[PDB]
Symmetry: D2
């Protein structure tokens, strides 16, 4: 049938990103304090508020986040990492999660558990058939956190916690994670590196972040060899490149693999107005990407698809990119993208030779059994 779940929790908007821009404010470096860190939670809150103010919320089934348990977290992460996060969160003013930039406040583990747990709860309810699909608008994000660490503002790897739950608790034999956050999903890649039961795909700007990963030659290991697929694209790639990648690589990979559930790491940092990447995707591009992936799920896994928020750093534009994806889930297309004409004139809608060549990963599809 048709019932679309939606997860927002007030505390997703209360993540304290501090007073720096990216790293902390630093007087010796003359990095002046600023009100809004690049990753400030207001960007995602504005998406939530637009979901409500547009009336999309009336077509969604609100789903309460339920805190991820230690057992849930341990399906994706090491005990040492979980214990370190408990340690850092218990410090009187929080602290450094290990990388020197990713911080948690005192009690910040509460929000990290609710973020991973929002993904799990939506996954559970879609997998059982209570819901047909859904969108978990979580924060903090997940895809940079590998098995043994926090990284890139990610405390736990939300989509991997959800995949682990689908595998262990729901008994699914095959799950796919499709990450279209513009940054390489190195954490997700790491977690399932040796494991063919979770197909991991990352469409991203080549070497945007991290600086040393996301190459096409990173394909997994052992029994997992062939079950990690990176699609690095050049800076300036737009809707044409992204849709060519979907049609030539992503959708064929999903059809070859036959997952029982598709989890999308849904970032909007590939947008035309994002500060933290150089891509040219518009809300109409994300719309088409979502439509294609939802339709693929309908064909191959009884429509079982869960979108989980990753990055995106335009408070101005991200809400409209997100809303387009929500509208593809609900089928209620009731608000225009007010930037559409303005951004459409900038380009990205022609498949350039260098973009085409980057996508033409195609010979690796044959190794997905």
């Amino acid at each position: 049938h048709h019932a679309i779940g939606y997860v927002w929790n007030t505390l997703y908007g209360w993540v304290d990103t501090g007073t720096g821009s990216l790293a902390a404010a630093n007087l010796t470096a003359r990095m002046q304090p600023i009100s809004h860190h690049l990753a400030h939670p207001d960007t995602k809150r504005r998406f939530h508020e637009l979901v409500c103010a547009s009336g999309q919320i009336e077509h969604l089934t609100p789903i309460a986040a339920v805190a991820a348990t230690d057992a849930d977290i341990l399906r994706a992460h090491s005990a040492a990492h979980l214990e370190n996060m408990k340690r850092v969160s218990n410090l009187p003013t929080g602290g450094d999660t290990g990388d020197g930039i990713t911080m948690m406040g005192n009690g910040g583990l509460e929000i990290a558990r609710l973020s991973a747990g929002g993904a799990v709860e939506l996954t559970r309810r879609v997998a059982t058939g209570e819901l047909s699909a859904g969108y978990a608008l979580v924060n903090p994000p997940g895809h940079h956190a590998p098995h043994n660490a926090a990284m890139g503002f990610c405390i736990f790897n939300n989509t991997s916690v959800a995949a682990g739950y689908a595998r262990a608790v729901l008994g699914m034999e095959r799950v796919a994670i499709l990450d279209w956050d513009v940054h390489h999903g190195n954490g997700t890649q790491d977690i399932w590196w040796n494991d063919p039961s979770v197909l991991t795909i990352s469409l991203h700007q080549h070497l945007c972040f991290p600086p040393d990963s996301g190459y096409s030659t990173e394909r997994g290991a052992g029994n997992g060899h062939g079950y990690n697929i990176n699609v690095p694209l050049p800076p300036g790639s737009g809707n044409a490149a992204y849709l060519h990648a979907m049609d030539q690589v992503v959708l064929p990979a999903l059809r070859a693999y036959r997952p029982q559930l598709i989890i999308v790491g849904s970032g909007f940092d590939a947008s035309m107005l994002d500060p933290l990447a150089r891509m040219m995707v518009t809300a109409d591009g994300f719309r088409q990407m979502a439509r294609r992936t939802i339709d693929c799920a309908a064909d191959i896994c009884d429509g079982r698809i869960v979108f989980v928020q990753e990055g995106g750093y335009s408070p101005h534009y991200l809400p409209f990119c997100g809303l387009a994806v929500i509208e593809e889930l609900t089928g209620v297309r009731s608000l225009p993208d007010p930037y559409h004409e303005f951004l459409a004139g900038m380009g990205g809608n022609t498949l350039l030779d260098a973009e085409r060549a980057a996508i033409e990963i195609v010979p690796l599809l044959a190794d997905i059994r």
Copy 2:
């Protein structure tokens, strides 16, 4: 000798950009109000504050802005445009300058006059030999405003007001305006379209803004034919492309033309972290661009070079891009770019075939007499 002028006026930081993102907030469109418009003056104020906090201010000669007179403005703009700006500024709550997006507050003409006048005052003092060079950190910007209108948040075309002053008041026969704001300097192009006495050069992202201009075929008209040079570059172009453009096109054009003064429209919206374009220039890239242009001025026009602020929309990073240019003027290189390693890993430092081909404008150099 060596004396570097620097213009900042408090009111440059008081430009009211409203409560929208780009266009105004709009309830029917569900464009939620936001504290900082993309063009909020804090970005440029943070540059000023870094100039001070870094100690660069101790190596600069502060120059007070002096309001541009009607006569000054009329060297670049029509009487109808000036009168319309006086009209709009006199409205009790200001209003629409004509394009439906560019607004002035009540009394906002004061700031527009100080912005153009900051460029004029620095130009005067460099041309006389009181100063060797300088940087006018003005706001609002100028380069989109054509002869008969305000456009793209530009009320008056600051660099053209300064060029007009150099021509009419100082009696210079040849002036060059080099615009490296990432958006096409359509206003400047328009003003001097028929005029070979002001060479206008625009290095920009192709079709970023405006959507219908900046093509290589836009070359001026009449006696001005050959004295407008557009260098449109593809999205994703970085330091390699920008420096190749400098070496192959911009610097040869300046040497062919033999201006008596070089005015640089110094935007930083080509930076790696800018939301309003897709280019990959780092602070080190802007440093090298500035070094090259200052050295060219030393060779061909007795060092007479005036930098005038155009766009740039990263409050995080613009200050460091600007500071690099200031350091090239003063010769005091006392602060690192704290983002250098982070951004250097993202690329843009290899000249791609498509970038090289866009630059290879070279056959037009022969028409500069």
Copy 3:
């Protein structure tokens, strides 16, 4: 017995565009520099809502959707000319001045004004029918300064008067009371019901804080309404002791004398210890005690029918805790401390000063005229 507490929040209450000025607009000639957050910026009320959710109070509330106030609803409190002027201003391509030179609406800003008044109406309807026992409408923009024929003091429509008008005309209640404890005089509400004894209007406020020329004890209504408007102006620096003495000596006796069938509270928190727009010393515990007293009074005299409707309050730091205290008195679930309690308790306001006592006692002889 029955317990179900309604709660109204609409996303658009947080989207009210207060501009780039502090109070009036930014002004270059006056050298009033633009600022991100106007004093009345919606974030203050949004932070209250978010605390209601993050504290877990939301799990004890029954969410009630705001329904846009119709023209008919608005016309029970305001003139046709005022409604038409608001439709006119809201239809202007970039909105404009609502009449006073400071209160503005955006293009389409009438949508939010309707949802604000309509949130009060919807909660009133559902409490009056017995679906709900009581509730809190966390609306924005506020209401109490808007008189019959105008917008004023960032109020477009007089939300509590629209709700009272609905209770009177649609539900057929013969007597309604509006108790306003916003720190500013409820001049709009006073104006609307000035000649009308069917809506008892009470305003507890800082004397001459805003507006400058109203809220005196001598403003008592007119005609058949004479005696059915009660102002309790208090001196600057009044705190919990003064506010509770006013409740016990004046407000609660007035309500008991009048026997309203519904009590509507204009629930502002601008009397708080940390508010920039008044000089009063009320703490979250003070508002808690005020709410408790008023809810208990409603239980005694009108079958518990009480509707709280948000008015002002300008501390984004502290207002959420003041508001949460009132919500907790409605739900009976007292699960979070006021983290400012010790800090503010040391500042005073907890002793009834002679001047405060005397200001309150000025109103006591007027209670006898409430029939």
Copy 4:
């Protein structure tokens, strides 16, 4: 005769990192939501500076560069342990807690604390030598809560005491006065000079506003310093009438009795009508009159030697106009109105209430002990 008015602003005064809390840090367990602007955010003082410039007052001032306070400078007001603790905290990779659990410094935040104290010192030196007639040091962080052995109340070092210590030890002045009209008790300054009659310390403040346990009239110094600390605690709601009565009856007579060779004013604007962190009713015209009186007193008794040093004040909207009024009294160029004047004048505070008069009169018998 001579007229040259020094003015200190340093960009880094605007870069003080006040964090993401309201007052204490953001706290998830307490459900204190993060906020962009802490109550003490530097933008309030930066907006004052920008108004000094945009109003054209800057053209009538002599800009004076702040020079970092040396260890020797700091040690005239504070203990070696406190200085070493501040060097320790500032050297920590991400800074930390200065001791009280709320006052923090960033890594390298000692640089700004030194520039703040050093701005006061540099202006003091240049006024005392006769290079300047008077001046205003618009410093941040503030000073007056920091006692000899600690940081407190967002004060790292006691700027005015560092300046007084310099005047005493380096310039050889035998008598200095510090007049603090920040609305909070200058407990730090009181502590530093408690036993010392060579620095007369006066604090006009809201009674028990902050700290909670100090500022009583009975706190008069000790030993040879007995009689050389004067507290003037005023009740909440006191306005221009009370403040000017306190100036005329207590402050100015105390200064005339003491005959300081230099007057340092701890110039806070947190007594303003719109301040969130106190309940007083002073307007820009009130601060203007206070400044005029004090400058004229300096002209009469110490050859015009007066240095104003910024303390608190938490209205980004209104503080700039309060500060500008003081600057205009120094320059004598009165070129911009207070655009809030009419709005605030209607709220009151301009009548001397009996309780206000009595609070002030409590201090008058202590004037006789100033020898």
